[PDB]
Amino acid sequence: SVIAGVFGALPPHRYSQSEITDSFVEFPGLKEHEEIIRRLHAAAKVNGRHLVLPLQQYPSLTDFGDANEIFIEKAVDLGVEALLGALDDANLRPSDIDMIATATVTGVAVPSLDARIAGRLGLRPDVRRMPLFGLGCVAGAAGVARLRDYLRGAPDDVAVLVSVELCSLTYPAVKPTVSSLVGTALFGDGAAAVVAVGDRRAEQVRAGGPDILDSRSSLYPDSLHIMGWDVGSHGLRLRLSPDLTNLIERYLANDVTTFLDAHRLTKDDIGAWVSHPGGPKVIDAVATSLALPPEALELTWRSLGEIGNLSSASILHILRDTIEKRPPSGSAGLMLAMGPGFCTELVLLRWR
Template sequence: MPQPVGLLALSTANAPYEMAQEDVLAAARRVMEPNFPNFARLAPVFATAGILKRQSVMPMEWYLEPRGWPERMAAYLAGAVDLFEQAARAALDEAAVTGAEVDIIVTVSSTGIATPSLEAQAMGRLGFRPDAARVPVFGLGCAGGATGLALAARLAASEPGATVLFVCVELCTLAFRMDGLTKADIVATALFGDGAAACVLRSGAEGFAEIAGYAEHTWPDTLDIMGWRVDPQGLGVIFAQAIPPFAREKLRPAMDAMLASQDLTAADVDRFICHPGGMKVVEALEASLELGQGSLDHERAVLADHGNMSAPTVLYVLDRARRAGLPKRSVLTALGPGFTASTVTLAA
């Protein structure tokens, strides 16, 4: 990295409607069980996912009716722009920066389509300059919080003194499906929530952490592990392979290689800050990285309070970790479609 990049601010923004996991299960049973014979066999995932409550951009009743592309994307545009504004405004306020002082805006979102993209939609609300560079990124999925932060850091390092705003917004609940149900749809209904997070970065500036490195690893022949299917009803989740056993077996060698590229080993890392895809994924991460069982406490807390929000989730974990006090060196990491592991190394 040419010049150290300071992480000046971090904020999160919750979607407006809260759903208790027991209420989601009751609604899912009422609507899904008549059309999906194996629902009773899969229903325990609602209890074992480690989730107590989640937030959504629409009230629960909205999801119980058939919805097609136009309705889902209208809900995405309205909800995502609002959450973008909330997260960005809070991060800018924390950094004591105005929208007019932002030079580059990196936006990550994979749960809907907006053209013009979200940062353009929010431009007037936040007072961005007409010459601000816009970098919208689609398709990163759950890895987007880590990969997007790394991209923002690369851009900040390449333009010394530039202020970079990174925002990720995911409305995973808009992919809840009641038609042609699959096992993946049931799991998604048990796991996913909505949320947003934002960061402000600047090279050469002192923040609550310094971005000291980043790395990615994409495994070959894994395109079908995670992604979206697209049909007239909207986006539907693909889980072609079980992710926890894959992470348990494959993550550690990839992590060792990513750390080695920065002249580090796992022993040099004081805290791994992980994307909690679900309770079984958290347990697999602890096993693969040889962490003590239960050591990923912030990850469990975020999962319990917000569910899996895809890209923003790991930044929610980082926010809890920094409030508790970041150690000297931590590594933020997330797994996502590709199938890819993405890391950002932080120095406090």
């Protein structure tokens, strides 16, 4: 399988980190925690973020019903904008799509996003639907792996992954507890789409982006608590452990090497790293444990600073960013993501 188009889409409201913090500190029930909020927002190394709602609308977003409704309205059109952009990058059409995978962790939609996006964009009624929910930040790498897994048995097919993460809209569940504030410093809104295509279909559509060669999921034992949501009446509340960093440093190099040994490869044999940004400590951790030079994660740091942590869609934004960089032809690309599980997901890429 080979990527034919990537496309990130963001809501048009872009705010500075400063503008967001300055306003956020003045939100109901928050002024008291200004010190830690500024600390956390500054330490986040996010310089700005696209929000789906005008910044000053958030204090009014206290109801999970409203929020999740706005999510469904906004997720789909961010999703279709993303999909179309990738469809056009692949010079393909909605009718060309044979399967659609949808990745979100930040909203609950039944009928799922894929159903609604497929409605909007006029996909064939018999598109295969794969609504992925609960992969979280890992869903961008994992979604790409699942496309491979699909196209592997359907060489003529077009399979799309649409990630939409509207982190902002989980605001109803946000309280001045440090974990929620950590998330309030890092997470922004945005969608992204990957149009992938089978090997046979590849030459017909002049498929540009990288070949998706292989993936390896890595579920860590006894680590449910590391990451995820505590779901409740006030909605999706971030659970996020400080232990996470130490899981990376202990075990990521192991995942990255066992997967790379399977391909007669090394750390140095990879031409562009495509890493999810949990936040700076996370980026430092994978950089440190994988003994990565500064340049290797620069795009994901740049993406972090430009649009923040978009969860699933992040790794697909920096994948789109790294594609535009045009890295060495035929060189190994390595998607690395991680999320609730706790798990990590390596995806072996090959660039053109």
